[PDB]
Amino acid sequence: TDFSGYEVGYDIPALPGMDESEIQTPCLILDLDALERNIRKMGDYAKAHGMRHRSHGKMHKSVDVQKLQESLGGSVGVCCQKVSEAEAFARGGIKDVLVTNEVREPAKIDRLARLPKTGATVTVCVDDVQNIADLSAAAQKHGTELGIFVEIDCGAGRCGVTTKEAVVEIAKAAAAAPNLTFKGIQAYQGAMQHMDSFEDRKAKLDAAIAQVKEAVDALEAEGLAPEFVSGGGTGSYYFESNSGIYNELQCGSYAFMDADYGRIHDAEGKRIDQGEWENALFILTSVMSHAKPHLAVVDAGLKAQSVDSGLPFVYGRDDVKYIKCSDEHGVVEDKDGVLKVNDKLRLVPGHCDPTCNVHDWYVGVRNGKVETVWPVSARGKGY
Amino acid sequence: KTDFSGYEVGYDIPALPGMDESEIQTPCLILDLDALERNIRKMGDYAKAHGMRHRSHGKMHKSVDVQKLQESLGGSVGVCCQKVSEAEAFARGGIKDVLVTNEVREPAKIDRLARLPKTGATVTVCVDDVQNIADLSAAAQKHGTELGIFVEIDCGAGRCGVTTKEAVVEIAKAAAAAPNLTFKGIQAYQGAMQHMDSFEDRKAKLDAAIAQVKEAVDALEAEGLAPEFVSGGGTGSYYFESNSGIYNELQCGSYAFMDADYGRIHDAEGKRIDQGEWENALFILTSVMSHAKPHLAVVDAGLKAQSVDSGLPFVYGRDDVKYIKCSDEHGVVEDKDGVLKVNDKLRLVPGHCDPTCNVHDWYVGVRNGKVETVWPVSARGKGY
Ligand SMILES: *Cc1c(COP(=O)(O)O)cnc(C)c1O
Numbered sequence A: 001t002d003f004s005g006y007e008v009g010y011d012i013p014a015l016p017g018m019d020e021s022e023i024q025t026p027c028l029i030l031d032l033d034a035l036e037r038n039i040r041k042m043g044d045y046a047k048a049h050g051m052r053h054r055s056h057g058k059m060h061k062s063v064d065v066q067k068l069q070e071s072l073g074g075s076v077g078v079c080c081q082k083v084s085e086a087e088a089f090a091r092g093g094i095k096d097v098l099v100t101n102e103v104r105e106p107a108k109i110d111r112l113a114r115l116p117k118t119g120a121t122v123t124v125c126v127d128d129v130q131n132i133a134d135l136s137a138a139a140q141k142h143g144t145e146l147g148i149f150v151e152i153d154c155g156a157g158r159c160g161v162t163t164k165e166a167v168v169e170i171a172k173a174a175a176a177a178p179n180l181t182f183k184g185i186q187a188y189q190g191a192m193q194h195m196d197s198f199e200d201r202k203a204k205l206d207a208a209i210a211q212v213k214e215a216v217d218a219l220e221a222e223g224l225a226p227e228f229v230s231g232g233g234t235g236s237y238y239f240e241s242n243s244g245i246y247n248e249l250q251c252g253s254y255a256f257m258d259a260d261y262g263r264i265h266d267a268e269g270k271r272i273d274q275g276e277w278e279n280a281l282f283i284l285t286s287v288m289s290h291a292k293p294h295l296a297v298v299d300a301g302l303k304a305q306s307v308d309s310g311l312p313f314v315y316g317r318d319d320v321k322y323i324k325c326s327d328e329h330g331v332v333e334d335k336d337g338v339l340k341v342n343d344k345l346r347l348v349p350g351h352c353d354p355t356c357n358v359h360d361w362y363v364g365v366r367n368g369k370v371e372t373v374w375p376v377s378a379r380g381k382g383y
Numbered sequence B: 001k002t003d004f005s006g007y008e009v010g011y012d013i014p015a016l017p018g019m020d021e022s023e024i025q026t027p028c029l030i031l032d033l034d035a036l037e038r039n040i041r042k043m044g045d046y047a048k049a050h051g052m053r054h055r056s057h058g059k060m061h062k063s064v065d066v067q068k069l070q071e072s073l074g075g076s077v078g079v080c081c082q083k084v085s086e087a088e089a090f091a092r093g094g095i096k097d098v099l100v101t102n103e104v105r106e107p108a109k110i111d112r113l114a115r116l117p118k119t120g121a122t123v124t125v126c127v128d129d130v131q132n133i134a135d136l137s138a139a140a141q142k143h144g145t146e147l148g149i150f151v152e153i154d155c156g157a158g159r160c161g162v163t164t165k166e167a168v169v170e171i172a173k174a175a176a177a178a179p180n181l182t183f184k185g186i187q188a189y190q191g192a193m194q195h196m197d198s199f200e201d202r203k204a205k206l207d208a209a210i211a212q213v214k215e216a217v218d219a220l221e222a223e224g225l226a227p228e229f230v231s232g233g234g235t236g237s238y239y240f241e242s243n244s245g246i247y248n249e250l251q252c253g254s255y256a257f258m259d260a261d262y263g264r265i266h267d268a269e270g271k272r273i274d275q276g277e278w279e280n281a282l283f284i285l286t287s288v289m290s291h292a293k294p295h296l297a298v299v300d301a302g303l304k305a306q307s308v309d310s311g312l313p314f315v316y317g318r319d320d321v322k323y324i325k326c327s328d329e330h331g332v333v334e335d336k337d338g339v340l341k342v343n344d345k346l347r348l349v350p351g352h353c354d355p356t357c358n359v360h361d362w363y364v365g366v367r368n369g370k371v372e373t374v375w376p377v378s379a380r381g382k383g384y
């Protein structure tokens, strides 16, 4: 780990060995103990249910976190939303990459078809039979093999096909196409993941499972039984795991957590951040103005995070409240005037994935010290 | 100059100079260089016609190259920066006059601030707490540099700054007395009113801010601390500061690029300011990557390619399709006529330019269908 050329407080927030009080704000810290407990717990859950877990790299965009998910959580590989992101993971040594998305632009397809030359195994999703010919041609050009998932729109309304006939058509084309292998089904119900009610989420996944089952049966009737039936997120994984239809999970956010996931309820009606998953990702911020008696202004505003899923909150205390932000300022209510200039706070971000994607580093803290500083390997890699 | 050898199109840069616009990799940010230059000239000409300095705000674009264009074509007198690390990026890029339009309190940040004049930059910083003066002076003394001081007034935005003329005078006196500091004037930015729809509502808010600033100027003058600069103003207010007789420096930022949330506010003729006053120069370029449903297209620019803090982007230059939804790596475009095909490209006007610029590392400057420039977002992610 050589950080030569970097400058703390200019292009990196900290270096291994620093005390946490020396970290430059605003930045992202990882509670390494809690991260590791989250990773172990999901890996144990998947194993106990006979499920593969392909950890989702779109969330943290970090080769180092993915390697920890593989070593400590038994993750079988990484999921990626974009080809450039996939390539960042493959260049970092990740050996099994699933692009949980469609790739259609010719230069993107060419880059995808080259990726296996890194030594990584590569699978991609398809929702348009016309895409098969392009992928096959590119794989033939580079002398590579690509795996194919057919993506089913099982309720999220994004990409994917909506009938079992469409699924069979794409799978048949994949099987017949040179240098492609039909590997199974992508069916991620992303739209239901943040419903507060466990029973509501169960009902949505019940419907997805029934649709996926019709597709599995149609494929089996054609001699194209899907090796993998892959999906599931931090708000649903128990349902895919109990289904006997899915055999691979794609959970991402559980490792870090955020406020929007944290507030949804488990089967007992308890917030999932109050027992199921721990907060491991925080924005560290400093108070930099307090001219009014009961308002503190901190240095983490919009550009240090996102607000697509609401505001962050101050972690570990309930006497102050993050209520507003502009681009480079956050306004924290301080009704008892207990915050002072240069005090530090930890914020749980509203939404982990976009927050991670506006930073270049994670400061991994343990026992009050900076133990690791990990690059956000795939930040901004949306091509 | 930029060295592109470390980068790779389609992996960590969207394009290279000389490419055809059809070859640009999506999602990315493009700048219509003609429109950008017309916006920059127009603001510069407006400022000069009103005898105002314009200090272009670098927090918006975070680009040394755009700032240099604002100086060369718009007559910008210098840059505004919101954070010390952003200021360091601009000073290291050769920008000669840097105002940090924010307070700097953390000791290591102050130490970094105090070294910035060694780049050749003149450096000014804002103060809203008299106790900050001693820390700034100590660092400047330690490193043999000079720092200028603006006292920040909360003139209605309710962010940083002080709210009494007595507090202003106290800070200014301390700056004047402190070694290696010089009291340079007032920071008074009414950011909260900038996006009110009604020009009349905006005028009234700035009337109140001007009155408060004038009282502070009067109090300073009575103490022998007349402010050399009285600086503020944004893209939604600049005509008020420019006709106030009190402000002498503007800090407009967004006008150069524009976005949807600014574009929708109305001018004194009841028109959207993006329908006459300022042109759209910043676009998100995006490709259709799925069309499995007959009347929906999915594009490759979602939340991670922009922001939604100020609402959705919109499709520019056509009326037959509509960006209605986005997830992290997808945008959903209504296509009720079924005219969009996979790999078609669309230009989106971002909802909010500043946060959108801060999630990308490059601007693809296009002119006459070609990539003329590829400029780095010099200060992306520099929030320290
Ligand atoms: C983002 C994503 C996941 C992981 O989702 P979480 O809700 O973050 O756990 C899984 N599958 C796909 C296809 C995704 O896009």
Ligand SMILES: *Cc1c(COP(=O)(O)O)cnc(C)c1O
Residues within 6 Å of the ligand: B057, B059, B060, B080, B082, B101, B189, B191, B194, B232, B233, B234, B235, B236, B251, B252, B253, B254, B255
């Ligand atoms: C952002 C900002 C400006 C410029 O704002 P626009 O509304 O984008 O033109 C000016 N002054 C300060 C202090 C700012 O923070």
Ligand SMILES: [Mg+2]
Residues within 6 Å of the ligand: A253, A351, A352, A353
């Ligand atoms: Mg998410």
Ligand SMILES: [Mg+2]
Residues within 6 Å of the ligand: B254, B352, B353, B354
């Ligand atoms: Mg703005």
